[PDB]
Amino acid sequence: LADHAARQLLDFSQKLDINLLDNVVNCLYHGEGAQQRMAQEVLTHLKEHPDAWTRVDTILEFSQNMNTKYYGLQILENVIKTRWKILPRNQCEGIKKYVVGLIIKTSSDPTCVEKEKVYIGKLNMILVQILKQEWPKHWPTFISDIVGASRTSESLCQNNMVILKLLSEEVFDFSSGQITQVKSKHLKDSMCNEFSQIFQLCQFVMENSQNAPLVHATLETLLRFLNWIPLGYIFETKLISTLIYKFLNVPMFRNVSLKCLTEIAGVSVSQYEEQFVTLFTLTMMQLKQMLPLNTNIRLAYSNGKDDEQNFIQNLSLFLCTFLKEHDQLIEKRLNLRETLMEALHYMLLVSEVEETEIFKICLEYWNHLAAELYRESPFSTVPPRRQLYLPMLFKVRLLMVSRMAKPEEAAAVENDQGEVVREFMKDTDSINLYKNMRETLVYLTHLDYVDTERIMTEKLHNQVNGTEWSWKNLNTLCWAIGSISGAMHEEDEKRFLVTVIKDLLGLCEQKRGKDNKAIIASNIMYIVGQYPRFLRAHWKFLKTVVNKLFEFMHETHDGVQDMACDTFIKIAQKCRRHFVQVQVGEVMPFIDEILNNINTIICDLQPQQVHTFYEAVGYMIGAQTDQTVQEHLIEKYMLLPNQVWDSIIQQATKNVDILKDPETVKQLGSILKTNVRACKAVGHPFVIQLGRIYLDMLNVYKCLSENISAAIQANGEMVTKQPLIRSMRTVKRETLKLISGWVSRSNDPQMVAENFVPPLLDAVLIDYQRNVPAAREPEVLSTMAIIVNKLGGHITAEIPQIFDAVFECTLNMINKDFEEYPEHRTNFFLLLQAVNSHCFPAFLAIPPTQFKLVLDSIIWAFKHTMRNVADTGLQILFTLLQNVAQEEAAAQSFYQTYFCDILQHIFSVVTDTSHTAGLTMHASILAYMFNLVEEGKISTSLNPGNPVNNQIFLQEYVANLLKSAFPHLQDAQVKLFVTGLFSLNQDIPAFKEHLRDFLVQIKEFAGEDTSDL
Amino acid sequence: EPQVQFKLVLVGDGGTGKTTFVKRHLTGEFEKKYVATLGVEVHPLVFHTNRGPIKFNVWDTAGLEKFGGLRDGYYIQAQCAIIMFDVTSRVTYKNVPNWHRDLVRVCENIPIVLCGNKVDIKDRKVKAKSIVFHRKKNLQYYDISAKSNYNFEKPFLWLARKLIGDPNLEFVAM
Ligand SMILES: Nc1nc2c(ncn2[C@@H]2O[C@H](COP(=O)(O)OP(=O)(O)OP(=O)(O)O)[C@@H](O)[C@H]2O)c(=O)[nH]1
Ligand SMILES: [Mg+2]
């Protein structure tokens, strides 16, 4: 229990206290807090000790529990994995005989086979590790032996099946990053070479054994071989027929068999047409037995035990795999039509199961079928393939309409200041599900417009008569009705839309309650939102719609206001040109009417809703071609925010202290949000508005920044969580979003530079510098980043002043550890990357010592374990190397000063197991640098090995570096690896793999030998 | 309403968000820093459900190799598992079969959820149409965000349903 008591296990001069090892191991699985951590610490040190394996016998002989014993095994596995090649041959043979020994015994004990099967598993793994290290050369009779023992004894056979699965796995499935390419190849070839003997044993057991557990293991092992074995074994034996007749229809073998049949089904080859046909035919015949075609599979799944649910999943996998790969095979054969329709039947039934994962699998098939029929022909209301499917295509259309997923996904999210904002998710699983469903329904709609409309007409009628009425149902149908927008001809769709709208309006009438009207109107809004093309042709409808949306912005029933705003932005972008030209029958363009009435339209909206409203109008204003007109639109557009703004500025000149008033500050934040959304929609032209507020906005930013700093000086970051502080950070952040938002969208760089950049220095940059560390706004670094990427040349002259404000004081926050100020690390490197990409001369203008601080910080970035930081750092370094090379003048003194130094730092991160996500970039950087030397660097990398040519000097230096850091590496390993950095400098994938081989070798000890080939 | 407790093992490459996810469930805070978990930290998570309380002992394991500790040894006696990856890093999804391998070789028949974390981020690198590993391994898959609160409770809900044996279990507040 006391640390110094548990450390007793590490003495190695005393005999092992088995009782103590049991307590520690017990503390590991059952202890809490600090005592469990101590166990974890002691047991890790013990497992890693060079001499721990000596006591493994003791552990397995005297340990009372299986936990301890399993731990014993962990120690033995580590020794084989790390130091098998430096153990004396005599200890190896002893370990072999001890492990097969222990395997024979435990898998011969029936209690053991029942209860301690995890332990058995681990022993099997031990053996496999031995095989991975020396199987073919130092154990040539292994396979014959395993086969012979297997035919000698049933208990050996059962376990030996597990060993072979594990071996197959390790060699064919998990070899990358664990074993070198040459050894990996050797292992595969050696397994290919002896497979027939193994296959024969599996065939023998399958054809003759009456041992259920043994048969099951055999099938689990076959399932792993199917991944790699030559096709001959799969398709030119009786394997398929055996699986189907013998196993598929036996409950306890049903899942393994089907999974095997699925792997066979996925093979795509022209050679085995007949056997694919038989696989389908025969499988269908068995499925008709175990799962009659009139089963309710939805209920079966709902009610089924675990392996019934599995079974139905595997069935959708088998049918989906088989038909995606081989449907034409069944299509061409007339006497198989009924079996093909039966397979479609099953897919439809399995399609009813209420589990997303299964539905997705079925959907993958429906999507394939629809795609194929539409590739065959895309015309409506007859070509040959479509002909076969026409009896049931209505059922797929019906399935799509009935189960259509939600098309957009809105969430409530807290930001860094404690506001809950309404966001929409992008590219999620459930959104991708929607898109696949749309595509399926859209393809099937093109094949028959009438059928789709028929189905929709009917679902709608059953809303109206209350038969199928619910919020959920009506939603589904409306989602569906929206999904097929664009699939009909314009004439058909006009007629279609009109019917749909009339019928839903009728149902709005019929249904009473605010709740119901909100649901129905939301659906109507959604649908018309999805049909801009109709809105564009019928101005009178578009005007009614927009006005109706303006009415809805005053209904505070939950959801109505969001829907009106959401629909209004959809329509504003899709139809913007309609708001700015004078429509037929109209006095002014609609935008004028809208702008003159903003004050009444938004009077009841929530602030977030206001922001979305302004964005929508932004797009309309954006679409006005004439510049002088657009300016007057913007002036008027911004009028209400400008009033509150001006008023608050006036009070602020009067007394800086209202800038501490909760309400004033909320309001500034809300006004700035509006400016950001308006700029997002309007783009460059918003310059007129940005300019009006610029200097006042920077001055409030500066006061608030000082207030925040002072508050943190006085009462720390606890004061930071406070509400008022939060809403002041809002203002700073929106100020920065607004500057960066406009700049990004500007297209007059000379202007931005002379006009907007200069005032940032005293208000933002020097303000950041003077801010207390915990008060410095990380978004400052991101805004500069965005600014530098947009201006490039235009801002190169100002880098010196920017970095004097931010480069050093930031570095100092992030250079004590790798963890603190995460957003500062991320944004600071993005700024550096901007300067290095777009203003490279600024780096040349600075003195060597200053440039040294810059490289040091680049190097510091790619040593991060925050992958984003490290990846940007690696890209910066790559971009810098390429830049340096542009001018022969500085290039060669850069090489002379820094080349070798950079190499060492790259090597320290390539050879660390924590940085493997950087491999591609490590490879690119290393390959480029090695290639640079092997083609010519004028100045000697070593100042006085005047003789050694850079290439010879590099080979000796890098080799020496590596021998130094990894002393257990053999000379031939280092040489072969260094040579490869030159050979493979043209092939980054091969260079990449060369590094990965190296990482394998540095984690093990070899002795006076090598994997040659 | 008796107190059932389950050993839940949480595995995945480093930086995926294993620790951030547990901390948000434990305290409601979102940790922005990446502080690698050394070895394993076990954190009790109590959910209240419409059929009484359920406690998961989350064994939050280390994803970097250098900090692995006892690795697969932590998995002994686990009753369920979550495998995490980061949808902004292809390497993490590629290494998911490796986490799955080590896990089932120690606990063969346990409910396992696979989660793709960080779906809040705009530049998604592991596309939803790519994530298929769980199908043949009979796993649940949920797209999740420790930061946006997207599908935040879904992994525990599924495991709880599968462990209690009640498909209709729901989580309740207090
Ligand atoms: N954007 C975003 N970032 C996230 C999310 N979840 C976590 N992160 C961030 O990603 C990092 C994940 O860190 P950890 O949770 O410590 O990493 P881990 O997976 O536990 O890693 P190890 O303990 O090293 O195995 C942290 O910086 C988090 O702030 C998420 O949903 N979205
Ligand atoms: Mg962690």
Numbering used by the authors:
A (entry chain A): 8 to 388, 402 to 1033
B (entry chain B): 6 to 179
From the paper:
CRM1 (chromosomal region maintenance 1) is an essential nucleocytoplasmic transport receptor that mediates the nuclear export of a wide range of proteins and ribonucleoprotein complexes. CRM1-mediated transport is dependent on the cooperative binding of the small GTPase Ran in its GTP-bound form (RanGTP) and of the cargo protein to the export receptor, forming a trimeric complex that traverses the nuclear pore complex. The overall architecture of CRM1 consists of a ring-like structure that is composed of 21 HEAT repeats, each consisting of two antiparallel α-helices, A and B, connected via a short linker loop. The NES peptide contains four or five hydrophobic residues that bind specifically into five hydrophobic pockets (Φ0–Φ4) located in the cleft between HEAT repeats 11A and 12A.
Structural analysis of several inhibitor compounds bound to CRM1 revealed that their mechanism of action relies on the covalent modification of a critical cysteine residue (Cys528 in the human receptor) located in the nuclear export signal-binding cleft. This study presents the crystal structure of human CRM1, covalently modified by 2-mercaptoethanol on Cys528, in complex with RanGTP at 2.58 Å resolution. Recently, we conceived a crystallization approach that allowed us to gain structural insight into the cysteine-mediated covalent inhibition of human CRM1 by the classical nuclear export inhibitor LMB. However, when the same method was applied to crystallize a novel inhibitor compound known as C6, the obtained crystal structure revealed the unexpected covalent modification of Cys528 by BME, which became an obstacle in obtaining structural information on C6–CRM1 interactions. The observed shift corresponds to a Cys–BME conjugate, revealing the covalent modification of Cys528 by BME, known as a DeStreak modification. While the disulfide bond fits the electron-density map, the freely rotatable methyl hydroxy moiety was not visible in the density, indicating that it is most likely to be disordered. Ran is bound in the inner core of the CRM1 toroid and its binding is stabilized by the acidic loop, which is arranged in a seatbelt-like structure. The NES-binding cleft, with BME covalently bound to Cys528, is in an open conformation when compared with the unliganded cleft of ScCRM1 in complex with Ran and RanBP1 (Cα r.m.s.d. of 1.545 Å for the cleft residues 509–576 and the corresponding residues of ScCRM1). The reactivity of both the cysteine and BME is most probably induced due to the higher pH of the crystallization buffer.
